[PDB]
Point group: D3
Chain length 237, copies 6
């Protein structure tokens, strides 16, 4: 349990990213620990609500950078795409608490949560166009931001403030940094009073509407677009 | 015609919920009168625009749960498919513009009355909620939530049962305009009057352009999918207690 | 190139609507030239980003109708399907970032010029509308309204024909940024210049990611569906008066 | 009961088209009686299965064109949207199994009667066609063609106006079974009888499983889209001749 | 590892997964399904495997879910367990990024379809009989609604409404079965086909499979499967409201 | 013109693939000429129906085989995907007459036609899996053949007879080789009697149903999957296949 802390109390499972020395950059080991924590929470009948949070100044700087396309495709399809979709589908409510920087692969950790609470000084970005890739592997951008904002931030690599993403509906609530854990836990507690099958089916109502709208199919389509970026990058260098 | 009043003047059909003594709680009889009113307005060539409004402090407290031998899910499923789902979809598709005027509380089944309207004008005091998760059900029968609020707000308000102010739902696009409560009726009628000057077939097809876009996006199919999700909640409640809600 | 000016420098193709004396009303000749300019930009290896802008006070007043012995719906359908629908979709899909700079009035057909652009920057003074219901038609030929405004706002502005301010459309996400009118061109070019530092294939695939998400959501199919709904408007106007619109 | 006969026995509602003097061509009166018969069967708890059949040599020769000072597309659109599109979708969605027994010719509008049924049994002699391109229209109002035939056969039969045999439409899956003409009623009745033994809620939800799969695939949205395409045909015919069909 | 119900062999780049509960006509209890899921995972993760073959010992491919296999039984409980071992398992097998082939002999009833439909290709013995008679038990078809996609809607409704069986030749006509072969050659024909496919480059196979499966998901496959799962569960909900047990 | 012949008579535009010495293998010049021919037919108000046919033994052996992924992507998106979709959408009926072998890229020529008439001898295949690619650029396979048959023929590279593809609905009619041109022209002639706007909208009714079902979006999705095959082939060897 190096990289990920796990606590259960009052029917809330709190999963903490604990690699602040690297701004919670994600290596394969961290991702495997994180996927195990989600599974543990999903399987525990004493857990009603999942809280995903991070220690330190920044939620996550993204994937830790430190050969065939088939190899990249296979690895990214598991740890990036399959993991994030599995988290998305866990049949209990989940809430991310985001402070400071949430960059590129960071979005693959919070987007799968049902609700997001952000500190006022949180900054969200996906500057991977600079590295020759058309946005990260799990394309929540268009769904979360709308297409024009998604294009703007992909084309420029600029950051968005917490208030800006709250306006698009990607962030549910913006609170001062000193209230982020308070607000997240209070909301988790309110939700934890509710019947678990009703929570499950409320979640399913919304997620199935998104899937009818094309969410699953679109996420799969964009994964292949992303991979053409890797294929081009390899062909150049 | 106890529960629903109906007026036609100046090419506007005004349908009024008139059960203020129960905060416009909806029993089968009210819903049948309401559907007949919508049909009357739809079929009247002297009506260009439909206004739906409510008497009293509150638009609607929702379904009236005080309105057989061995109760089965088949029975609940059949009845709710007719008076909740089919009725609300039928209103949604009436080929003339419709405007809901919403004051005070609009709770759970109240949403099945205003969401089918094309436009919603809300009083500053309006409070929208769907707290049915408390009763073991994953939101009301007609799932406009994700479409009207976006998925994250939809989940938030279903998971918590909290209310949203008129200003909050205006931000999502669910409400077109927010006005002081003393101006709700006048602003709604003024807007209806502006729209009533337009060519009826253009109004019909403008409405169709937007609604068919939504159907291509998956609206019809999603509404049908979530109805079955809703009904699994009744099924579970019955398996726990013998009753369709906890 | 009578009505459209084309300039390339700094990795930017600037395409300018140059009919200010008619408030950039669009006749078929202007549209043919505009389509040629988009195609030229798409093929130009000196070009990373496209900027669409307009001379004068107004971005575009819409389609020029001042602009066949037995007139038929078949004829209207065929021409509108090419210069309105096919052109706008082709611009939409050009595999390079595009930015519309919109000042003053952008009415009805005007929207067919800016909606296909990836990003829209509007002057504080910009006013967007689609009042064609007055002419017996259910919104313009390319139905961006629902996608850009949300369904309730789309219905409201079609049913009433009212205008929306730059601020109003920025709240729906249809406009990316609102800036003072005297900064519109500078701000647009600065943003284009930022984007033009990026690798072209990454820009193309970022654009694709978003536009393909939209097509999976139903964008292409919905645009085609609404085109026919629009054409039933022309069909009705013709059945009433023998003319494509109510006059 | 001028045009439509109706019988309920062994939990089967049999709806019979009874206008052989016009080869079961459909005037508004016949369609109104037919819709009433479907509603009656839908609402009757003693009915588990619906059978639609026809008297005489032909299932239906289609819409009766022999059954307003300034005729407008608005008027045509409004009427066709009700008795053609809305009626057929309503029958499609009745929450009980339905079976069409089709003999002889089923032409154009005839398809609006059998396609909404869940299952089709055809006589060996049956001929299916939609030659409405001759009248300047892109196929009938309710576009099952692509769904039932596949897109290439749909285009071929629309573009040529040719008829398809029972065998040919059985190969596409549009017809479930082909039997000799003198066995059509007996085979249909036996099939209905087999289905009528099953629990009604399971029948309802098996039907929903398939029909909701179709709506997620785009059926409802596609049907609505093609109705507008159809109407552009009327709009063009009126622009050429002042009449809805060439 | 403990092996109980599933035989597993890897040779010549083919993983052959065998249902080995012929004493129960390969009726599927939760343990069998867990073991079968593990076998699919083993094959998926083995770089020496290019193709997966699913087959069954004895006369019958699978009689379906084992009926004889909590103080207060609730729909939540049934929903949770079926969502895992029926729906999630079958979707996971569907998505394994290597070609898979089912060899189907004799009866393949109801839950049996959840084992073969996830395979890419189906080879059936001339004697194979496919059915889903669960309407008799008050349920609108099994949990993973392949029926409409595999059979077309009219055939799907016919066989659900009647509970009748379809011959191998009948399902081959809809495209659900790729090839019908004599019973005594089913294993040889299947392995020969697996061998031919196992000569191809693995990434090209993966992306050919993806091309088709992603086309199906754009068409609505994932969303429709999820939708019908809830329809199926309303059947259980109703059966419990009538009798207290999840099937009539 | 070098590779494509074009004739208009009796309201039929006949477009002929005329590179028989190469079994109508498709180089970029041939494809540009083909696209020009489709455009000419589409724009000619005296043409009601388009017939696409081929000289020699074979309809088309596919793309003529005789560097970055960006370059391959750009070129294939134009001449293969954009061209084929443009042809698919021409607002007039079109009919392909397919004799002999139609392999891989050959499918990009006939699938965009509304109707396909095949000689009894015709053989259809897509063996590109052998070259490390997940089927050709325009993924009609699932739509035309169904998913199981599409997977089988992609995974094996086997050919399908005219009778087999007729059973799936991909071929409208199968006729003897010596009657292919006559049967196609007679069918075109029947269709050319019909009102052009009704033909247009009949075509639209079916094609829009397909696009509501997901056809446009799916074709775009699979194009990217195809390009990951080129991406991988280049990462192994340096060439696209
Ligand atoms: Zn990556
Ligand atoms: Zn309910
Ligand atoms: Zn127009
Ligand atoms: Zn008609
Ligand atoms: Zn079950
Ligand atoms: Zn290629």
């Amino acid at each position: 349990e190096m990289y990920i802390d796990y606590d259960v109390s009052d029917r809330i499972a709190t999963i903490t990213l604990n690699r602040p020395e690297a701004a919670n950059a994600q290596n394969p080991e961290l991702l495997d620990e994180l996927d195990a924590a989600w599974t543990r929470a999903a399987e525990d009948n004493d857990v009603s609500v999942i809280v995903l949070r991070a220690n330190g100044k920044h939620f996550s700087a993204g994937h830790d950078l430190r050969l065939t396309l088939e190899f990249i495709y296979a690895h990214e399809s598991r740890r990036y795409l399959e993991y994030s979709l599995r988290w998305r589908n866990v049949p209990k409510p989940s809430i991310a608490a985001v402070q400071g920087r949430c960059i590129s692969g960071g979005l693959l950790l919070c987007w799968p949560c049902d609700l997001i609470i952000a500190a006022e000084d949180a900054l969200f970005s996906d500057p991977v166009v600079l590295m020759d890739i058309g946005g990260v592997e799990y394309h929540g951008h268009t769904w979360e931001l709308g297409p024009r904002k998604a294009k703007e931030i992909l084309f420029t690599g600029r950051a968005m403030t917490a208030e800006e993403v709250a306006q698009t509906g990607m962030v549910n609530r913006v609170v001062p940094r000193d209230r982020l854990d308070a607000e997240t836990r209070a909301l988790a507690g309110e939700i934890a009073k509710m019947p678990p099958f009703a929570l499950r089916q409320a979640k399913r109502a919304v997620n199935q509407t998104l899937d009818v709208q094309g969410f699953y199919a679109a996420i799969q389509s964009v994964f292949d677009i992303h991979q053409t970026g890797h294929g081009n990058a390899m062909s150049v260098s």
